Amino acid sequence: SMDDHKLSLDELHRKYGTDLSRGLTSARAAEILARDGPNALTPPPTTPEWIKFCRQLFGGFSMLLWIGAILCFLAYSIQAATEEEPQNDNLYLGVVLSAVVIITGCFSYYQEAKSSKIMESFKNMVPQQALVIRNGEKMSINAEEVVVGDLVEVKGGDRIPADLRIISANGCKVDNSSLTGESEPQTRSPDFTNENPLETRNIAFFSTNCVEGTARGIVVYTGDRTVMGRIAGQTPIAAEIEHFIHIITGVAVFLGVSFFILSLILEYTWLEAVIFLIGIIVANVPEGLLATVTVCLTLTAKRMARKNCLVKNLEAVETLGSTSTICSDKTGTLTQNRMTVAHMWFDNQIHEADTTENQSGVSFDKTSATWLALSRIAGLCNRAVFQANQENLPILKRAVAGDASESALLKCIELCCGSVKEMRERYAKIVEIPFNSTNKYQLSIHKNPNTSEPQHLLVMKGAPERILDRCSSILLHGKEQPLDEELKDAFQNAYLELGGLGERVLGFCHLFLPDEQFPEGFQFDTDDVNFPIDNLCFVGLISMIDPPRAAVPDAVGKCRSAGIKVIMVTGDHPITAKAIAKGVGIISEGNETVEDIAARLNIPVSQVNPRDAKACVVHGSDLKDMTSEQLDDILKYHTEIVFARTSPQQKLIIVEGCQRQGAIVAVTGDGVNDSPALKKADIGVAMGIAGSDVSKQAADMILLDDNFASIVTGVEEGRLIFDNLKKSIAYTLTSNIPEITPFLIFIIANIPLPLGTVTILCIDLGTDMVPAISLAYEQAESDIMKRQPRNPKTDKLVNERLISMAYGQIGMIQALGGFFTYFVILAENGFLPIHLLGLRVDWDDRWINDVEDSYGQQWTYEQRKIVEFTCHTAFFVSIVVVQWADLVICKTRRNSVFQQGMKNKILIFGLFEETALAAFLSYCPGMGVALRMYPLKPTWWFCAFPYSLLIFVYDEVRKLIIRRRPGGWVEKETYY
C-alpha cells in the first residue's frame, strides 16, 4: 500500500499522535502498544511436540524392532488358533521387543528436547536496543515494543528497528541489500524525489542500516506490517559421524545376514532366525552417537556463554577449537580503553602528571604561561561534555560523553584549572572541524570574550609526527622561538622516551592571528582554507598511559604454549606498539626485530640479514604497496608480527594472507569498515559493549566482556569436544566382540550357546544407552592447551588406532571375561570344559532326554536349558562388570584417573543404573518365564572381577608409558 512519504511534516502532525519533538508520551505509549502489535516479527509455527516424538519412536533403526514385535505377535496369533496347549512364548518376546523401542525412543526424545531447549535459550541473550527520544531524554529500549509515532535517532552502524520516515538527517546512507539487491549505500533526505514509494529517499526500511552520518526519523509501521514483515543445518563434525555410521551399518548388515543364513542350517526355527538377525543389526550399529554429538555441541555452547563468549551458530563451535591464528586489535580488546594522563613534555623537560591528591605541585597550579597556554589548548579542544549528577562527585569517578583521549584530557582540566564550561563560553567556538581520519586535525577557531589580545587564537592538535611539518616554533616563556635542529632532536628524544613506556602522544600548537584576517565583526570560515598552517606556535606534548586488561598476559602465554600465533593490528606508532607488545607478551624476551640487533651491534638496519630476527613490526604504509609475495613470507619467516599504523580497512589483506599458509583465523572487529574482514575470516569476533550492529551481524561470535582472554577460554571449550567425542566413540565400540563371538564359537567349537538374542538386547540397552552419553560431560584434562591445533584435513575422529583398540584389544578381554563365567557355571553343575566340545547336537535335541555329563548322571531337555539360560544371564552380568572398567578407563586419554577425579555425576549414575538393571533382571520373580533369566548364586558375581581388573591395569600402564616417553612406539601405535 501507499506509505506516507509523499505527505510532508504537517500531515505527519495530522497523521499520528501530535509529536515531532520532546518524545511522545507515557499514556500514548501504552495506547499504541495496545493498538498495533509489538515489534516482534511473528515466527513460523514448527512441528508440534508429538510429531517430534513419533519421528523418534518409529524412526530409523526402530522400525526393525517394531516389525520384530509384529512378527512375534503374528506367530502367537497363528499358534493360538491351530494348536492345542498353545504355550505363549512368542507373546513375551513381542512384549520385550516392544518395551525396548519405548525405552530407547523415550531416551532419544529426551536428549533431543533438552538440547533444543538449551539452544533456544540464546535468543534474548543479547537482545536488540533501539534509541528513542521519548519525553524522558533519549533512552535505549528493548526494541521489541516501539510504537508508531515515536521519533528514533539512529547513527552509523545501528540497525533500523521499525519502518521509518526520516525527519532530519546528516547524510545517512542505507545499504539496500535486503529488498533490492544493491551493494551500494544510498543517501537519505527528508525531501520527496522518486515517484516509486520503495526506491525513494522519504522513508527508511526495517532490517537495514544507515552506515555513516546520523538520522532522526519517525515510525510509520512496527511488527508484521513493515515491508520486511510481509513476504516470506549440518555441522562438519556431524557429517562425519553420519559417514562413520553408514560404514558400520554396512558391516553390521553383512554380519547379520551372514549369521541369519548360518542359523537356518542349524535348524533354528525361522522366527528365532529373524529375531536373531534383528538383534544383531540393532545392537551392532551405534545409533546413539547422533544424539551425543548434539549434546556435545549444545552443552559446550552453553558453557561458552557462561564465560562471556556467545556463539551465533553451532557450526562455529567446532571451528573455534581448531583456531591457529588470532588477529586482534589493541584498543578495547587488549587494553581497558580507560586512559589517564601521564608524563607531559614541554620546554625540554619530561614532567609528571601528578594525578592523585598528593599534589607534588610539579610546576602546576601556578603562573608559567607555557603550561597555562598548553592547558588552555587541551581544554578548549575537548568535544566531550559531562552529564547530570556529576558536579557533586569526586575526581575518582566522572561520567563523560566522549571518546577516550578527550575524556582523559578533561580530567586534568577539571582537576587543575577550575570549571570547563565557563572556559567554553569565554572563548567562543566560531568554526568547528570534526575529527578527520586523513590528517587527524582537530581545529576550533576562537575569539576573546571581550578582550585578551589583539591577535585572536586558532588551535591545532593531533599526531605529533603529522603536525611536525605544520607547527615548528616553540613556546618557551611566551616567546615563539623558531625552528631549531637540536630542539627537533630533543623532540625526537622526547618522542622515544614517551613512547618507550607505552603511551599515545598528542601534539599541541596554536596561532595568534591578527585583526587583518577577521575584524570584531564578520569572522572567517575554516572550510575554505585561507589560514597559514606552516611554522606555527608549538607548545608541548601530552601523553596518556593505558593499562592492559586483567587476565591478558597469561592468556597470551596460554596462546603461546598451545601453538596459536597472535597478531596485533593497531593504529599507533611502531615504537608504542612494540612497547605494548613487549608489555603483554606478544613479543616475548629473546625475540627481537632487525632494529634491535642493528642498534645492538651498531651496524645500520638496512644491511642486517632478515633471518635471525623472528619478531617483526610492519608499518601500515608499506602494506599498501607490497604485493602478495612479500606478505606471504613476512607471515612465514617470523613468529611474532605486529602491524602498526594500520587502517582497519586493510585488515582484510592480512586475513587472506594468513589463510594461504593454512590457518583458521579469528579476527576481532567492531566497526563498519571491518565487515568485509569479518566474513572472510574463518571465525569473526564482534564486540559486545562497543561495536555497532553491522559489526555483529557479520561475525560468528560476540564477546560479552570485550576481553582478549575470553577468546582463549573459547578456544579451550572448543578444543574439549573432540576429546569428548573420541572418548564416547571409544567406549561405544567395545561391546561388539562379546556380542559377535558367542555365536562364532557356537559354530566352530560346537559347544552350547553362551548368549541369546534377548540378553544381547539387554546388553545393548543396559550398557550402551546411559553411560555412553555421560562422557560428554567430562571435564578437561591438564593438557588441552599443551597440544598443537588439530588440522581438519589430516586429523579425523576415527583412526586405525581407535578401531584396533576397541575391537582388537579391549573387546577381546570382555569376550574372555564372559566365556570364563560361562565355563564356571557349566562346570559347577556337572559339565566339565573338555566334555562340552561336541555337545551342541545332542544338547539342542528336544527328544533326547538323557544327556550324560562328566559325572555320569543324565539330564532332561528342560533341565539343561535352564542351566543354559543361567549361563546367558551371567554372561550379561559379567559383561556389565567389565563395562565398569571400560567406562572408567575411557574418560581420559593420556592422564591417569587418579589425577582426573570422579567429578562426573552422570558417570556414577550410569554405573549404578547398569548394576541396578542387572540385579533387577536376574533376581526378580517373574523373569523366569518372561525373559528366561534365572537367579545367580552370590559367588557368581565375582567371576569377571580379574578381567575387569586386567583392563584397568593394562590401560593405566599404557598411559604411563605414553606420558613418560612421548613420540615413542606406544604413542605412535596405540594413542588414538
Binding site: 555425576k905 556414577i908 549414575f909 541396578a916 533387577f920 533376581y923
Partner: protein
C-alpha cells in the same frame, strides 16, 4: 539335603541391593 538350594534368600538380598543402588544413583544425579 544336597538337592534344595532355597533361592528366596538371595532374591531378597538382590532386590534390597537393587533398591539401594537405584536410590543412591537418584541421590547422586539430583545432587545439583
Amino acid at each position: 539335603d544336597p538337592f534344595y538350594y532355597d533361592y528366596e534368600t538371595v532374591r531378597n538380598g538382590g532386590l534390597i541391593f537393587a533398591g539401594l543402588a537405584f536410590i543412591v544413583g537418584l541421590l547422586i544425579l539430583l545432587s545439583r
